[PDB]
């Protein structure tokens, strides 16, 4: 009687003034904050 | 009697002044904040 | 008597002044904040 | 005289017998191949 | 006279018998190949 | 006269019998190949 189990568990985030936040994987692009000429 | 289980679990986010937020996977593009000429 | 279960769980988001927010997968485009000439 | 340019470029994919393929932002779910009881 | 440029460039993929392939941002889930009871 | 440039460059991939392939940001889950009871 093979039992299995998993739990990705409890998280919590409190953020403020955050230009970017999260997970990406691949970026061939340009996550620019501000350009000027 | 093979039992299984999973739980992606409890989360919470409190954000403010956040130009971008979340998950992407792939970006071949251009996540620009501001361009000027 | 094989039991299974899943729960994608409880979330909550409170946001303000957020140019973009959410999940994308693929971007071949251009998520521009502001262009000027 | 401000020139810009971008090119997400040229790609090619040849696949076979591929249970899943592509880009995902977030998965709180269960991309299972096969369950049995 | 401010010039800019970008090029995410030229790619090629040839695959076969690939249970999963691509880019992921976040997985709170379960990308299982095969479960049995 | 401020010039800039970028080039994410030229790539090539030739694969076969590859259970998983690509880029991941976060995994709180379970990228299992095969479970048995």
Tab-separated table of C-alpha atoms in Angstrom:
chain	number	residue	atom	x	y	z
A	1	UNK	CA	0.000	0.000	0.000
A	2	UNK	CA	2.365	2.656	-1.366
A	3	UNK	CA	1.451	6.058	0.107
A	4	UNK	CA	2.855	9.324	-1.297
A	5	UNK	CA	2.411	12.986	-0.353
A	6	UNK	CA	3.652	16.494	-1.226
A	7	UNK	CA	3.081	20.032	0.067
A	8	UNK	CA	4.400	23.150	-1.677
A	9	UNK	CA	3.820	24.876	1.642
A	10	UNK	CA	2.759	28.228	3.080
A	11	UNK	CA	4.167	31.555	1.753
A	12	UNK	CA	3.498	35.305	2.194
A	13	UNK	CA	4.923	38.459	0.626
A	14	UNK	CA	4.547	42.126	1.587
A	15	UNK	CA	6.137	44.498	-0.919
A	16	UNK	CA	6.248	48.249	-1.643
A	17	UNK	CA	7.876	50.374	-4.399
A	18	UNK	CA	8.988	47.304	-6.406
A	19	UNK	CA	9.727	47.966	-10.081
A	20	UNK	CA	9.488	44.249	-10.917
A	21	UNK	CA	8.748	41.110	-8.917
A	22	UNK	CA	8.235	37.431	-9.736
A	23	UNK	CA	9.680	34.531	-11.714
A	24	UNK	CA	10.741	34.629	-15.376
A	25	UNK	CA	12.471	31.486	-16.756
A	26	UNK	CA	13.948	33.095	-19.918
A	27	UNK	CA	14.531	36.689	-21.040
A	28	UNK	CA	15.892	37.450	-24.524
A	29	UNK	CA	14.378	40.921	-24.155
A	30	UNK	CA	14.990	44.063	-22.104
A	31	UNK	CA	13.449	44.657	-18.681
A	32	UNK	CA	14.336	48.341	-18.688
A	33	UNK	CA	13.535	50.679	-15.798
A	34	UNK	CA	13.905	53.952	-17.746
A	35	UNK	CA	15.609	55.130	-20.951
A	36	UNK	CA	16.289	58.768	-21.894
A	37	UNK	CA	17.803	60.429	-24.995
B	1	UNK	CA	-4.663	1.060	-1.421
B	2	UNK	CA	-2.277	3.664	-2.848
B	3	UNK	CA	-3.154	7.105	-1.442
B	4	UNK	CA	-1.723	10.328	-2.917
B	5	UNK	CA	-2.129	14.013	-2.047
B	6	UNK	CA	-0.857	17.489	-2.995
B	7	UNK	CA	-1.390	21.059	-1.772
B	8	UNK	CA	-0.046	24.128	-3.584
B	9	UNK	CA	-0.600	25.927	-0.299
B	10	UNK	CA	-1.624	29.318	1.072
B	11	UNK	CA	-0.188	32.603	-0.326
B	12	UNK	CA	-0.820	36.368	0.040
B	13	UNK	CA	0.631	39.476	-1.597
B	14	UNK	CA	0.294	43.165	-0.710
B	15	UNK	CA	1.899	45.470	-3.268
B	16	UNK	CA	2.044	49.204	-4.069
B	17	UNK	CA	3.684	51.257	-6.872
B	18	UNK	CA	4.759	48.136	-8.820
B	19	UNK	CA	5.494	48.716	-12.510
B	20	UNK	CA	5.217	44.985	-13.269
B	21	UNK	CA	4.453	41.894	-11.203
B	22	UNK	CA	3.901	38.204	-11.945
B	23	UNK	CA	5.313	35.250	-13.867
B	24	UNK	CA	6.364	35.264	-17.534
B	25	UNK	CA	8.060	32.076	-18.854
B	26	UNK	CA	9.543	33.605	-22.053
B	27	UNK	CA	10.157	37.170	-23.249
B	28	UNK	CA	11.514	37.846	-26.752
B	29	UNK	CA	10.035	41.339	-26.450
B	30	UNK	CA	10.683	44.516	-24.466
B	31	UNK	CA	9.158	45.196	-21.051
B	32	UNK	CA	10.081	48.870	-21.136
B	33	UNK	CA	9.310	51.274	-18.292
B	34	UNK	CA	9.707	54.503	-20.307
B	35	UNK	CA	11.412	55.599	-23.541
B	36	UNK	CA	12.124	59.210	-24.560
B	37	UNK	CA	13.645	60.792	-27.699
C	1	UNK	CA	-9.325	2.131	-2.841
C	2	UNK	CA	-6.918	4.682	-4.328
C	3	UNK	CA	-7.758	8.159	-2.990
C	4	UNK	CA	-6.301	11.337	-4.535
C	5	UNK	CA	-6.668	15.043	-3.739
C	6	UNK	CA	-5.366	18.487	-4.762
C	7	UNK	CA	-5.861	22.086	-3.611
C	8	UNK	CA	-4.493	25.104	-5.489
C	9	UNK	CA	-5.020	26.975	-2.240
C	10	UNK	CA	-6.008	30.403	-0.936
C	11	UNK	CA	-4.544	33.644	-2.405
C	12	UNK	CA	-5.139	37.421	-2.114
C	13	UNK	CA	-3.663	40.481	-3.818
C	14	UNK	CA	-3.963	44.190	-3.006
C	15	UNK	CA	-2.343	46.427	-5.616
C	16	UNK	CA	-2.165	50.142	-6.493
C	17	UNK	CA	-0.514	52.121	-9.342
C	18	UNK	CA	0.526	48.951	-11.229
C	19	UNK	CA	1.255	49.448	-14.932
C	20	UNK	CA	0.940	45.705	-15.613
C	21	UNK	CA	0.153	42.665	-13.483
C	22	UNK	CA	-0.436	38.967	-14.147
C	23	UNK	CA	0.941	35.960	-16.012
C	24	UNK	CA	1.981	35.889	-19.681
C	25	UNK	CA	3.642	32.658	-20.941
C	26	UNK	CA	5.130	34.108	-24.174
C	27	UNK	CA	5.774	37.641	-25.445
C	28	UNK	CA	7.128	38.232	-28.965
C	29	UNK	CA	5.683	41.745	-28.730
C	30	UNK	CA	6.367	44.955	-26.813
C	31	UNK	CA	4.860	45.719	-23.409
C	32	UNK	CA	5.817	49.382	-23.571
C	33	UNK	CA	5.079	51.850	-20.776
C	34	UNK	CA	5.500	55.033	-22.858
C	35	UNK	CA	7.205	56.046	-26.117
C	36	UNK	CA	7.949	59.628	-27.213
C	37	UNK	CA	9.476	61.132	-30.387
D	1	UNK	CA	17.645	61.674	-35.277
D	2	UNK	CA	16.912	58.809	-32.870
D	3	UNK	CA	16.640	55.425	-34.614
D	4	UNK	CA	15.570	52.256	-32.780
D	5	UNK	CA	15.029	48.651	-33.865
D	6	UNK	CA	14.195	45.200	-32.476
D	7	UNK	CA	13.953	41.706	-33.960
D	8	UNK	CA	12.716	38.687	-32.007
D	9	UNK	CA	14.370	36.638	-34.731
D	10	UNK	CA	13.895	33.397	-36.635
D	11	UNK	CA	13.017	30.060	-34.932
D	12	UNK	CA	12.149	26.473	-35.929
D	13	UNK	CA	10.841	23.474	-33.979
D	14	UNK	CA	10.418	19.857	-35.100
D	15	UNK	CA	8.964	17.592	-32.405
D	16	UNK	CA	7.233	14.216	-31.989
D	17	UNK	CA	5.670	12.202	-29.146
D	18	UNK	CA	5.814	15.200	-26.801
D	19	UNK	CA	3.328	14.992	-23.928
D	20	UNK	CA	3.501	18.760	-23.370
D	21	UNK	CA	5.319	21.597	-25.100
D	22	UNK	CA	5.301	25.380	-24.808
D	23	UNK	CA	5.605	28.213	-22.311
D	24	UNK	CA	3.697	28.583	-19.032
D	25	UNK	CA	3.525	31.589	-16.681
D	26	UNK	CA	2.115	30.004	-13.506
D	27	UNK	CA	0.812	26.548	-12.625
D	28	UNK	CA	-1.065	26.120	-9.336
D	29	UNK	CA	-2.658	23.023	-10.877
D	30	UNK	CA	-1.495	19.564	-11.943
D	31	UNK	CA	-0.090	18.807	-15.397
D	32	UNK	CA	-0.308	15.068	-14.872
D	33	UNK	CA	0.687	12.532	-17.525
D	34	UNK	CA	-1.369	9.595	-16.189
D	35	UNK	CA	-3.003	8.572	-12.887
D	36	UNK	CA	-4.214	5.049	-12.026
D	37	UNK	CA	-6.113	3.624	-9.028
E	1	UNK	CA	21.823	61.513	-32.553
E	2	UNK	CA	21.111	58.593	-30.207
E	3	UNK	CA	20.876	55.242	-32.021
E	4	UNK	CA	19.832	52.026	-30.254
E	5	UNK	CA	19.328	48.439	-31.415
E	6	UNK	CA	18.523	44.952	-30.099
E	7	UNK	CA	18.320	41.487	-31.655
E	8	UNK	CA	17.107	38.417	-29.768
E	9	UNK	CA	18.788	36.440	-32.528
E	10	UNK	CA	18.350	33.234	-34.500
E	11	UNK	CA	17.499	29.854	-32.868
E	12	UNK	CA	16.669	26.280	-33.941
E	13	UNK	CA	15.384	23.230	-32.056
E	14	UNK	CA	14.999	19.632	-33.252
E	15	UNK	CA	13.560	17.299	-30.608
E	16	UNK	CA	11.860	13.898	-30.266
E	17	UNK	CA	10.309	11.811	-27.470
E	18	UNK	CA	10.417	14.762	-25.064
E	19	UNK	CA	7.925	14.471	-22.203
E	20	UNK	CA	8.060	18.229	-21.567
E	21	UNK	CA	9.855	21.118	-23.233
E	22	UNK	CA	9.800	24.894	-22.864
E	23	UNK	CA	10.070	27.678	-20.309
E	24	UNK	CA	8.149	27.962	-17.029
E	25	UNK	CA	7.941	30.919	-14.618
E	26	UNK	CA	6.538	29.255	-11.480
E	27	UNK	CA	5.265	25.769	-10.673
E	28	UNK	CA	3.383	25.256	-7.400
E	29	UNK	CA	1.825	22.176	-9.008
E	30	UNK	CA	3.024	18.751	-10.141
E	31	UNK	CA	4.446	18.078	-13.606
E	32	UNK	CA	4.263	14.327	-13.158
E	33	UNK	CA	5.289	11.855	-15.859
E	34	UNK	CA	3.258	8.872	-14.590
E	35	UNK	CA	1.625	7.766	-11.315
E	36	UNK	CA	0.446	4.214	-10.529
E	37	UNK	CA	-1.448	2.710	-7.566
F	1	UNK	CA	25.987	61.327	-29.808
F	2	UNK	CA	25.297	58.353	-27.525
F	3	UNK	CA	25.100	55.038	-29.407
F	4	UNK	CA	24.082	51.777	-27.710
F	5	UNK	CA	23.616	48.209	-28.946
F	6	UNK	CA	22.841	44.689	-27.704
F	7	UNK	CA	22.675	41.255	-29.331
F	8	UNK	CA	21.487	38.135	-27.510
F	9	UNK	CA	23.195	36.232	-30.305
F	10	UNK	CA	22.793	33.063	-32.343
F	11	UNK	CA	21.971	29.643	-30.783
F	12	UNK	CA	21.178	26.083	-31.932
F	13	UNK	CA	19.918	22.983	-30.114
F	14	UNK	CA	19.570	19.407	-31.384
F	15	UNK	CA	18.147	17.006	-28.793
F	16	UNK	CA	16.479	13.583	-28.526
F	17	UNK	CA	14.940	11.425	-25.778
F	18	UNK	CA	15.013	14.327	-23.312
F	19	UNK	CA	12.516	13.954	-20.464
F	20	UNK	CA	12.613	17.699	-19.752
F	21	UNK	CA	14.385	20.638	-21.353
F	22	UNK	CA	14.292	24.405	-20.907
F	23	UNK	CA	14.528	27.139	-18.295
F	24	UNK	CA	12.595	27.337	-15.015
F	25	UNK	CA	12.352	30.241	-12.545
F	26	UNK	CA	10.956	28.501	-9.446
F	27	UNK	CA	9.715	24.987	-8.715
F	28	UNK	CA	7.829	24.389	-5.458
F	29	UNK	CA	6.305	21.327	-7.134
F	30	UNK	CA	7.540	17.938	-8.333
F	31	UNK	CA	8.979	17.350	-11.807
F	32	UNK	CA	8.830	13.589	-11.435
F	33	UNK	CA	9.888	11.183	-14.184
F	34	UNK	CA	7.882	8.155	-12.982
F	35	UNK	CA	6.251	6.967	-9.735
F	36	UNK	CA	5.104	3.389	-9.025
F	37	UNK	CA	3.216	1.806	-6.100
